[PDB]
């Protein structure tokens, strides 16, 4: 666990490749990508504030440091100061790792990381630097501030979480889960969306806590403009404890953002963008979520756009509670050639939903061709760059009108035999061959029928429903539905901690399930000597992932650090339970002599045993999701998600091997867009920590020290919570 918290100097780095796709765009489309890229870039910094207390200061310090001297320039100083190269290089790694993750905690696994190097040396490198001979006040006023927490390994700072265990800036420092829950119910009572809000608890002389629910908006509480949020800014009372709904969270940043978006408007290919954008403006201005909802609908009402875009507080993964969303944004061009091979899958999508283990009344009421694309990414702001996504994240819309499916094409081209660990010399062959092609399948299904399926049972205001009660029955029980989602209630608001992992698990499982279908393979051009292989490598990869997931599980807190990995582990356990020698984990020994493991998946037993385990599973998951049954959902999940040393596996003992063979993910550098006035051009870098540093130091040529200054301030304001 020494290296759990550091980034190896040899970490792989790749540059997102988009040129052609950016070229084909005529100037109008171009700028219409441009300003969105810049807005996204502007807003993505708030992730520093949403990640760690010391993050913003770090970003400022780094940006300045490299602004004064680039990697090659600062190198000479670093080395001259007595640093061996292998040290400085590790520093560069740490900076790039803070840039890509928009913080000092990994977007994947939510674990802290520090520069690998003696502190006393970096003190030198930073102080003796050119940047410190120019503004010697700042460098010391920062280095003294964020210096330690940069390298701090103290147990409680290692992972993310509420209470004494971890660190989260979504909440104040004194908040426990109890608070997230209380304030949660309080949010659903007034039906406030938890996405854009943060909870800050405070205490007076007597031990009575008061709660500040803050919203992210450009305009803090002041004489209002007469919007929704207007009437919503006031004091409330909840169960012997006070509540206050306020706004103005990360204001100036969103100033910049709304700017760039409005600059985006006039270039819109149709009314849809030009308006939905404005809606986003409203949302990031008033702090009104509904405003984002509207533009979220418009965004699907728009189809087949040359340039695809989106932004907001969206994915809820990194909230210890699981409600509040992490800000992001993206602008990417739609590739045509690879999209048709998806649109196909959309055309025949209708049928498949009815192949799911639950009756048509347990599934969404109509259907759609919401969209499925292949996007070459230009700008993706925030902590990470997903392979594919299904949004907007509002379920209600998913059933009523629709959603969208997004397969990013050029991220793939980036991520692709001794590192094949926990496989066999066969296998890995098939793995190398079919991993890439199958990837598209698993993603298409995950996105389309993963979250595309399912239906929520909600109680509308009046005692009526969104469905017909007397005709609906639970196949597991046989009774008539006794549970549902009532007004203001939502997936995250109920399942919370599990909601993300649970849902993801469902999606992936449907992935395998339908991956077993001849049709889908015919869509991806797989059959005969082909249709085997791909399927196999897919399932095999799923079980293997189930094994690797151990790394992201914290036994001491009995807590999982990720939704996807945890879900994968769960699926693995289900398969294991199916038994019949279909799956095996063997405590082998690697050629190096150290410990090791080999995952053994009998392929012949796939349909005879595994499938049943699956559709039973899916059946249960769905069933509990429709009625929104948390008791059964958890009991069924946290049981499956439990990690112990019981044989004939001993996951507690395996986890160590998983950590020894552990991998550290690579970094994806991103290109910029420079404004020439009447023209715009693209700025690309090398694939390396250095290149990425160069990408970030050039990211904000105009306001860079201004933005740095902001982050510094916005941090200093809330410094009293941690």
């Amino acid at each position: 666990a020494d290296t759990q918290y550091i980034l190896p100097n040899d970490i792989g780095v790749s540059s997102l490749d988009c040129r052609e796709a950016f070229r084909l765009l005529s100037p109008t489309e171009r700028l219409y990508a441009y300003h969105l890229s810049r807005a996204a870039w502007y807003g993505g910094l708030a992730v520093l504030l949403q990640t760690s207390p010391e993050a913003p200061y770090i970003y400022a310090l780094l940006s300045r440091l490299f602004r004064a001297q680039d990697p090659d320039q600062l190198r000479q100083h670093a080395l001259a100061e007595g640093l061996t190269e292998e040290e400085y290089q590790a520093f560069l790694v740490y900076a790039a790792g803070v840039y890509s993750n928009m913080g000092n905690y990994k977007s994947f696994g939510d674990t802290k990381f520090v520069p690998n190097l003696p502190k006393e040396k970096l003190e030198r490198v930073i102080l003796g630097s050119e940047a410190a001979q120019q503004h010697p006040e700042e460098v010391r006023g920062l280095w003294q501030t964020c210096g330690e927490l940069m390298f701090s390994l103290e147990p409680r700072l290692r992972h993310l979480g509420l209470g004494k265990e971890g660190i989260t800036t979504y909440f104040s420092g004194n908040c426990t889960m109890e608070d997230a829950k209380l304030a949660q119910d309080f949010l659903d009572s007034q039906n406030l969306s938890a996405y854009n809000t943060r909870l800050f608890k405070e205490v007076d002389g007597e031990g009575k806590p008061y709660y500040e629910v803050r919203l992210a908006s450009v305009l803090g509480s002041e004489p209002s403009l007469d919007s929704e949020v207007t009437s919503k800014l006031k004091s409330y009372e909840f169960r012997g404890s006070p509540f206050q709904v306020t706004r103005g969270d990360y204001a100036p940043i969103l100033q910049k953002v709304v700017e760039q978006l409005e600059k985006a408007k006039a270039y819109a290919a149709n009314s849809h963008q030009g308006q939905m954008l404005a809606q986003y403006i409203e949302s990031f201005t008033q702090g009104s979520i509904e405003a984002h909802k509207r533009g979220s609908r418009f965004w699907i009402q728009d189809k087949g756009p040359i340039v695809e875009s989106y932004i907001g507080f969206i994915e809820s993964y990194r909230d210890p509670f699981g409600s509040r969303g992490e800000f992001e944004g993206f602008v990417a061009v739609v590739n045509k050639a690879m999209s048709a091979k998806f649109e196909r899958l959309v055309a025949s999508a209708e049928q498949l939903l009815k192949e799911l283990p639950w009756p048509p009344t347990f599934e969404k009421d109509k259907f759609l061709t919401p969209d499925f694309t292949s996007l070459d990414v230009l700008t993706f702001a925030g902590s990470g760059i997903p392979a594919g996504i299904n949004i907007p994240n509002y379920d209600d819309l998913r059933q009523t009108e629709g959603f969208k499916n997004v397969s990013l094409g050029n991220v793939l081209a980036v991520a692709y035999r001794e590192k094949l660990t926990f496989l066999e010399e066969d296998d890995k062959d098939l793995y190398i061959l079919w991993k890439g092609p199958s990837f598209d399948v698993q993603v298409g299904l995950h996105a389309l029928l993963g979250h595309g399926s399912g239906k929520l049972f909600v109680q509308d205001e009046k005692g009526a429903f969104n469905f017909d009660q007397e005709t609906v029955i639970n196949p597991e029980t046989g009774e008539q539905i006794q549970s549902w989602y009532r007004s203001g209630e939502t997936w995250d608001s109920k399942f919370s901690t599990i909601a993300s992992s649970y849902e993801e698990c469902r999606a992936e499982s449907v992935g395998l399930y339908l991956c077993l279908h001849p049709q889908v393979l015919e869509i991806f051009g797989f059959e005969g000597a082909d249709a085997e292989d791909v399927i196999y490598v897919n399932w095999l990869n799923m079980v293997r992932a189930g094994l690797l997931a151990l790394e992201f599980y914290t036994p001491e807190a009995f807590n999982w650090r990720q939704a996807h990995m945890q879900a994968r582990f769960v699926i693995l356990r289900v398969l294991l339970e199916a038994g019949e020698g279909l799956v095996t984990i063997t405590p082998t020994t690697g050629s190096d002599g150290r410990p090791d493991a080999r995952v053994r998946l009998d392929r012949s037993k796939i349909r005879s045993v595994g499938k049943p385990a699956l559709e039973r599973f899916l059946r249960r998951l769905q069933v509990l999701k429709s009625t929104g049954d948390v008791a059964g959902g958890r009991a069924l999940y946290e049981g499956y998600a439990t990690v112990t040393d019981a044989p004939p596996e001993c996951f507690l003992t395996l986890r160590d091997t998983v950590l020894l063979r552990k991998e550290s993910r690579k970094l994806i550098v991103q290109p910029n867009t420079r404004l020439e006035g009447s023209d715009v051009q693209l700025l690309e870098y090398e694939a390396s920590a250095a290149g990425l540093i160069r990408s970030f130091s050039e990211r904000f040529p105009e306001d860079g020290p201004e933005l740095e200054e902001i982050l510094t301030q916005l941090a200093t304001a809330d410094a009293r919570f941690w």
Partner: peptide, 5 residues
Amino acid sequence: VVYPW
């Protein structure tokens, strides 16, 4: 909602 690489 995200499916990672």
